[PDB]
């Protein structure tokens, strides 16, 4: 899980 975007 990226901390700066929820985009895949």
């Amino acid at each position: 899980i990226n901390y700066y975007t929820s985009e895949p």
Partner: single-chain antibody
Amino acid sequence: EVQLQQSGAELVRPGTSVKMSCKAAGYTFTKYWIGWVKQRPGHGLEWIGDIHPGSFYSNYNEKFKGKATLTADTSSSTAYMQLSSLTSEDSAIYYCARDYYTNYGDWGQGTSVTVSGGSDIVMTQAAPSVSVTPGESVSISCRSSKSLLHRNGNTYLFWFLQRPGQSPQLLIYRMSNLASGVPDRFSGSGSGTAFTLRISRVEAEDVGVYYCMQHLEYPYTFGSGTKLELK
């Protein structure tokens, strides 16, 4: 179980601000994005933005930059949204939802507020409604203005049902995958730009509005909805 418990209805006047809350429980608050969604009559569902309560980083639909502010308090596991310069356009029900690996599978119950982009992916649902008799099967179509296929091999198309007086619920994730708790009467297929939700053996619990949504790229976008009703 995951719970998202939102603050109560607000009756407010134009020109003011309001701040609403979304108390999270049943999972690690700082691990997942929380998104916010606007349900305004005649305007389907509209995605406002999201926030990561670990980093505090937020992303907004440009349409809401200067309207909505997302914050989080890690001490109380609560997400907040503040709206400024309230107008009639802001009268709506607002939902928080937990993003589970791109799935909006957990939704708050909504907060009612009553006020007394060219490159965005356009999601279209040609049928405003479908009218069926119980036990019939039905197909509901959606199209996206660009491919929803990602380099990773997944197609980031989602189907939701919003039953009358309820929050949206996730039915199908990444084009074809059946969401937990959803009967296998529901299925999804598609080409990456055109999609079909199929419902076998329709029953009264299936009544409501079906929305497609893309979670490929910001801002996330929903179709206009197709209302299913019984004849």
